[PDB]
Every structure is written in C-alpha cells, then in structure tokens.
Amino acid sequence: FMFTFIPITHPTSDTKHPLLLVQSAHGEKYFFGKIGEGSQRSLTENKIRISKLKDIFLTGELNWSDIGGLPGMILTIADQGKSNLVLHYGNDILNYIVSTWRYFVFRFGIDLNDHIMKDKEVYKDKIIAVKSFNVLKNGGEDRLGVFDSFQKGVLRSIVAKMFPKHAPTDRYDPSSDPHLNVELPDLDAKVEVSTNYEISFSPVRLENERHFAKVLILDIPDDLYLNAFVEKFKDYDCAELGMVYYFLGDEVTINDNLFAFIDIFEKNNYGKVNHMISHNKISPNTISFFGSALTTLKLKALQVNNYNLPKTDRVFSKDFYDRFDTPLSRGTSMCKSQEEPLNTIIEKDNIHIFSQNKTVTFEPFRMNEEPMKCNINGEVADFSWQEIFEEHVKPLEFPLADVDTVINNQLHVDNFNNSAEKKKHVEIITLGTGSALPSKYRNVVSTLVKVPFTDADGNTINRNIMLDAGENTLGTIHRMFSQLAVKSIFQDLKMIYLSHLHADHHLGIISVLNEWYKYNKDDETSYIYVVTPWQYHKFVNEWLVLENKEILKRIKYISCEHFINDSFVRMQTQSVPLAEFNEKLELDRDSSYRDVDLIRQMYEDLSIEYFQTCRAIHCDWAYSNSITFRMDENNEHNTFKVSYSGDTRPNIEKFSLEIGYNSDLLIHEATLENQLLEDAVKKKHCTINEAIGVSNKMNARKLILTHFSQRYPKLPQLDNNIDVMAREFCFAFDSMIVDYEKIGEQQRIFPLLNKAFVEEKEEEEDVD
C-alpha cells in the first residue's frame, strides 16, 4: 500500500519530453505526461514492463513532438496483447489526432477508448483519483469547444473503425480502402490549452485511516501560458499537496516570473512541498539509448571517421543552479536569463531536477500526527566515455583502437562535410537501419543522401535528400551533430521522399518538416519538395493545419504515382465529405494527370535530370524510386544516379532492369536473414541474397543495405555462393557516414566486425 513515481524519459537530444510512470504497490500502472518520439524505445532499453497499464494521461499542448511516439506505442502495446487502453485529455482535439492516423494505424482486439475530460472532471479508479485542469493559453473558460456534436460523433466513429473488436478480412490494407478517404472537420474554433492533472490516492483502511499526499502535474509549453496559469491556480488549495511536477517547455524561460508562479505552491498545511522541474536547460542530457551508443562506439573503433560519438552536452541555466546548489563547474556551458539572481521563497532542499533514475515514493501517514511521507530517491545516471571504452572495446583488441584515437582526439570532430573530397562528392548518413519496431540496437529507417552541386564559378553547395524518416529520426540527428551543424543540414534539405504508408517509414517526417521550417522560415523563396503516396499528403495537410498552417505554404508535394514509369497512372479515390461517412466510391479523373508543371519546376530547382518511380511488391501504393542528379553547370555527362527500394519483395523486372538500371548507387531493403526465406516471401521483404540479386541485375556500381530485422547487432551472413556484382558495398548501421567514393572500405573490416558484438549476442541469448 504505496506508490512509486518512476520517470521514463526526461528532456534530452533523443527524448524531447518528460514521461512519468506511477506504479502502485502491487503493480497497477499509469502514464502521465507526453508520449513523444523514442518514448516506446526507451521502455525496451530499460526493461520496463507495461502489464496492467491501460491509462495514459496526456498533458500540455498536443503537437507532433508531444505524441509522435503514441501511434508506435499503441501498435506495440496491442501487438504485446493488451486488452484495453484509454487515452485521457481535456479537449476534443484528441479524437482528431488519432483520426489523422487512419491510413497507418489499425489493430483489432484492442479496446482503445479516448476519454475527453471536462475542465475540473475527476476520474475515480479502484486505487487512484485524477482531477484535470485546463489552462487556456489566452482566454478563461471553454464554451462551444472546437467541434460540434455531429463532428465529435464522426471522429469517434473513425477511432472505432481503427480499433475494432473482431478481424475485418485477411487481405485488408488501410491504404487501399476507399471509406477512410473522409474530409476531417475544419479547425476554425481551435483552442490552445494545456491540460494538467491533480493525482490523489485512495486512503488505506478497528484502527484509524492513513492518507496519502497529493501530486500535481503541470505542463507549461511557453511563457505566454504563465499569465493564464497564475489566474487558474492562485486560489488553489495546497492543503495536502506533497509534490508538484513541472513539465516546462523549451520556450519557457527560467526567470523571476516563472518562480512567482512556482511560489504559489510553496506551502502545504503540514510543512513545505517538494518541486520537480523538467526543463531542457535544467535536466541533464544523458545518453538515452546506451545500446545504440555502445554499438556506435564499437563501430567507431573499427572504421573511425564513419561515426560520430553521441553528444551529451547542453547549455544549463546558471540562474537556477546558482540560486540552489551544485553550481556549474565552469567548463560546462551556462546561460543567464536575467541580470539579478532568482527572487523566490523556495528552499534548496525542496526543489529537484527531473531526471531518469530520480524516482519518488509516497507512503501513507497519520494526517496531523506526523509529517507527510514523501521520499526522493536516486541520483543522476553518471557516464564516462573512457571507462566504457576500456571495459567494453579495449578487450576486443582491434587494430589501433585506443582511448585516444577513437575517443579523446575524435571527441570534438564532426565527420560529415570536413575533408577536401567530401565536399564535392556524395555522402550517405544512415540515421536508422531497422524493420518495423524500434529495437535496442537499430532504430526505424531513415536514409539521408548529400548530393553536391558545383556552380559555374566552382563553389559547391549540397542538396540533402531524405529517404523515409521513421519515429525519432530528428532525435538521432540532434544526438550525433552539434547544433551549429544541424542548421547547415536543414538549410540544404531540399526534398523528402516516402516509399509507402507503413508507420516505420514516416512517423518522424512532421518533426523533420518542423525543423526544416525553423531554419528555412526566414528565406521567403525557400521551399521543400515532398514526394509521397497521396494518402500521406492527406495526413500532412490535416496535421499541419492543426500544428503550423504556415508550413503548408512551402510544401510542394508531387505524389509518387505521377512519376510511375508506366503508361497507366492509378486513379486516386475521391474524398467523401463529412456528412456522408454514414451507412462504390467514385475515383478522381483529374488525379490521373501528372502534375508536370511542378515536376519540371523540381527539376530546375534541384538540378534533377530525371526522377521516376515504380511499384513495389509489398503494400498497395508502395513504391521504389530512382533519381538522376546533374552535378555541375559545365558538364553534360556528369550525372549521379541513386535508387531506393521501398519494402519491396525483389522486383527485378520493373525496378532492377527498367527504372533502376545502371545506377551509381542502389539503396536496398535487406530485412530478413537468408535462413528465413519462407517468412520473407509472406511478409513481402527481400532476404540479404534476394537484395544482392537485385543489385546484380541492376548493375549497381555500388550497394548499401538497410532496413534490417535482427535480434541483436551482427553483420549479415553473406552467402558464399552469390556474387557481389558491385565494385564496392556496405551494410548500414545507425549513425553511419559513408562517402560514396569510400563505400568499399568496410569490406576490409568485415571479419573483425562480426566478433565485436559477441557481448550483445550472449546477452540476448539469455532467453534462448
């Protein structure tokens, strides 16, 4: 009869938002906070179990950063077999959110209910009780809301169609269903609201009854909210209030003004109240994925210059750290949000940094006899590059792999565009190299190709090209590079291509577009081309009208079917209006016409000589594609040709021999180990051989393999009986930076590479 408040994620390069798990004495579990990108992967890394959990209390404003991990989480918690699941929030917008995920989220046998809480509504459980409060950024009280009662009705119906009781038909693709092409309700009466929660606990039980402290969970996106937050909480009775949790946004600044809000909650009736601060200039930037970081470090020991080491630094808030204690050690970068020190009545032993191993436990107590029982356990997870080197990689004894050459003298060096050659010829960063589920060791797919273009005058600029981007792609980016380096990358990001509608390929695209906007915002003539299946353009539109309408004025979407190398262009479905969703559908004749104006305009802008696609043998509306880049003004013959499979079953007829043919570089899917050939054919992916076979008939001058399914990090088992028709090749690993010219210099290391992860083999074999 006790509760532990165990933090899952804190603000960090990989994990942008806080998430908190409250766990009962006998295992009843509830999430509070935000289910952002990487938040489902961080559960598996740390071996946390989600048995009994069916309640997610979503706080704050809901943009893509705050919920991009949620589609993933739902389809993972379903695949794990969870019967029910309830999403809580204080605004009807939540149903519009899940509704935007029609074409990519579908699971039967899960009872997914959305619970839209009124302003002061209580949710009583057997064990817990949870009252909500909705702060409204600018206004006071919520009147009509956002959607009318008909609009709310149809949105709930879409959610029901997404998570039905019984299986529909065995060959059912949400992509290829006409009834999901609905016109979602317009966001005109939309409101900016932070949802917060008060958590009370059920008393324990002739004798006399013991009570529990009350936890408040606040979520403040930015400063403009604070005026509304003081207006809503000034007269809030802090009687039995034991702790307040502050989920403070990036945009909120740590100044006298914030602490005038915090000061409201200085006292309770039986003593003082402890404060827990989650903020990105306060919480440390620890490594979130140690599996990945170790795997990356071992790989850097073999081929240095092809990996960056995970950064762990950030600027902290001097104002804060000085006003309490552990002031900064003078090497680490500080920030000073104001001239004067912090004006606040809070004591140092009653305020704490929200961090990963910093758990809090509440025991019950005799109301007015004794002080309220609350115990803040744990310390920040310390970490040392040198100490993990000597333990985990030094004993492997690789050629010239030592604590200096791998770590120390590499620690301050970006291996992206630095050298002479690297400027004027192609690079590929493989930011994710995995199938379906984010694993401990390989994140979901993303492939970023730098294709340079040299000018008449002879100076050379990059054309960065995104080829899919699953959950937390912008995370894995922010982690490898410094902030100074990310700006240049997004300023040169000219195109985003999606192969198909599976969630492992697109769930980071919105984050990517948000970041692209951050950097290209200010150039009125800066645009981004987005070539995707047409259903994903529905999403982008219905999402960005919610989150940032302005970005839609810079997106120049083509559509994959308008590049198909086929006389016949498949006709897309006509959008069925809102009214007529209730209980054949006409196709759109105009959708058959290639948007040739915009294609020609892409070619001129990005210097593409030819872009074309073909159909992948996988999903409906899947695609494989091939792009030919002219490399300078003063040369006709200087073309570079890239090709990228979707999740295709090997397609040697239409892709290898036709569109892909004679390509300088192929990037192909190699999901399955050869041993699982009969599973690959059902799941519609190539095996490592079937991939190499495609690369062969194509005549790929070079090859890269990605989208690996694996129980553990290994180099794939090459078949001795098959040739590599390809002057150079390599196997992708998360955060890897090849130069196109130097793709082959992995082959030299192939024998040693296999040895490197025997530690991770024996570990994952603990179940076998």
Query: Could you tell me the CA-to-CA distances from 264 to 134, 443, 582, 713 in Å, in that order?
Result: 18, 43, 50, 51
Instruction: Kindly give the pairing relationship between strand 214-220 and strand 241-248.
Output: parallel
User: Helices in 53-204 by DSSP H: which ranges?
Assistant: 64-67, 69-79, 93-100, 149-162
**Which residue, 585, 535, 529, is CA-closest to 561?**
535
Distance in angstroms (rounded) separating the CA atoms of residues 366 and 209:
7
Q: How far is the CB of 505 from Zn ion (least distance, A)?
A: 6
Q: How many residues does the chain have?
A: 768
For helices 534-547 and 509-520, give the axis angle rounded to 10 degrees.
60
Q: What is the CA radius of gyration of the chain?
A: 27
What residues contact residue 330 under an 8 Å CB cut-off, 6+ apart?
A: none
Compare residues 502 and 630 and give the one whose CB is closer to Zn ion: 502
* Residue showing tokens 């509760």: 3
3-state secondary structure of 59: coil
Give CA torsion, residues 341, 346, 350, 352, to 10 deg: -40
Compare residues 319 and 647 and give the one whose CB is closer to Zn ion: 647
Angle ∠(156,162,167) on CA atoms, nearest 5: 130
Q: How far is the CB of 468 from Zn ion (least distance, A)?
A: 8
Q: How far is the CB of 179 from Zn ion (least distance, A)?
A: 22
Q: Which tokens sit at 554? A: 């810079």
Compare residues 279 and 502 and give the one whose CB is closer to Zn ion: 502
Q: How far is the CB of 470 from Zn ion (least distance, A)?
A: 8
Q: How far is the CB of 671 from Zn ion (least distance, A)?
A: 7
Q: How far is the CB of 559 from Zn ion (least distance, A)?
A: 19
Q: How far is the CB of 41 from Zn ion (least distance, A)?
A: 16
Q: How far is the CB of 503 from Zn ion (least distance, A)?
A: 9
Compare residues 300 and 707 and give the one whose CB is closer to Zn ion: 707
- The answer to whether 244 and 273 have CB atoms below 8 angstroms apart is yes
Q: How far is the CB of 541 from Zn ion (least distance, A)?
A: 23
**Which residue, 143, 99, 117, 145, is CA-closest to 59?**
117
Strands (E), 483-576: 493-497, 528-531, 555-557
Q: How far is the CB of 644 from Zn ion (least distance, A)?
A: 12
For helices 290-302 and 385-392, give the axis angle rounded to 10 degrees.
70
Residue 766 half-sphere exposure toward CB, CA atoms < 13 A: 4
Compare residues 422 and 707 and give the one whose CB is closer to Zn ion: 707
Compare residues 75 and 159 and give the one whose CB is closer to Zn ion: 75
- The answer to whether 575 and 183 have CB atoms below 8 angstroms apart is yes
What residues contact residue 150 under an 8 Å CB cut-off, 6+ apart?
A: 578
Compare residues 12 and 709 and give the one whose CB is closer to Zn ion: 709
List residues bridging with 665 in a β-sheet.
Answer: 642
Query: Could you tell me the CA-to-CA distances from 132 to 118, 119, 219, 236 in Å, in that order?
Result: 7, 6, 12, 13
Q: How far is the CB of 504 from Zn ion (least distance, A)?
A: 4
Compare residues 96 and 623 and give the one whose CB is closer to Zn ion: 623
Q: How far is the CB of 500 from Zn ion (least distance, A)?
A: 6
User: Helices in 595-713 by DSSP H: which ranges?
Assistant: 596-606, 677-683, 688-698
Compare residues 95 and 435 and give the one whose CB is closer to Zn ion: 435
Q: How far is the CB of 675 from Zn ion (least distance, A)?
A: 20
Compare residues 504 and 515 and give the one whose CB is closer to Zn ion: 504
Compare residues 219 and 647 and give the one whose CB is closer to Zn ion: 647
Compare residues 356 and 446 and give the one whose CB is closer to Zn ion: 446
Binding site for Zn ion (CB under 5 A): 502, 504, 647
Give CA torsion, residues 350, 351, 355, 361, to 10 deg: 20
Compare residues 16 and 502 and give the one whose CB is closer to Zn ion: 502
**Which residue, 675, 674, 673, 672, is CA-closest to 685?**
672
